[PDB]
Amino acid sequence: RLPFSLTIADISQDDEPLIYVNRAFEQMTGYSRSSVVGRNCRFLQGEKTDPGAVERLAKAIRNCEEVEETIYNYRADGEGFWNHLLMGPLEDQDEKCRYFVGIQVDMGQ
């Protein structure tokens, strides 16, 4: 319930599902928490989303690395917006690197 959109994913589970989002995520994206928990966050992506940026994100996840990218996303009502995403391992010392945390900043249209 912080003053910024935050998400946590269990990247050890198939397709790296979201396990937690906060109210700021709901307000930015237009998706209810019920609708997104258990799904990979890429439901926010679409036709204009850059594949290079998506692959930088995937690579960071595979190598348990921090990453920052500005990516084109779509709200539930279909409005496109620029999402400045910063994410990385939740737990620096976890050799198994199970969880990833990300914040999203709406940079507009």
Task: Tell me which residues touch ligand RBF (CB under 6 A).
Answer: 7-9, 11, 16, 40-42, 44-45, 54, 57-58, 61, 71, 73, 83, 85, 87, 100-102, 104
Tokens found for residue 68: 């920052």
Tokens found for residue 2: 């912080």
- Least distance CB 109 / ligand RBF (angstroms): 16
- The residue of the chain with the least Cβ separation from ligand RBF equals 102
C-beta closer to ligand RBF: residue 34 or 69? 69
- Least distance CB 15 / ligand RBF (angstroms): 9
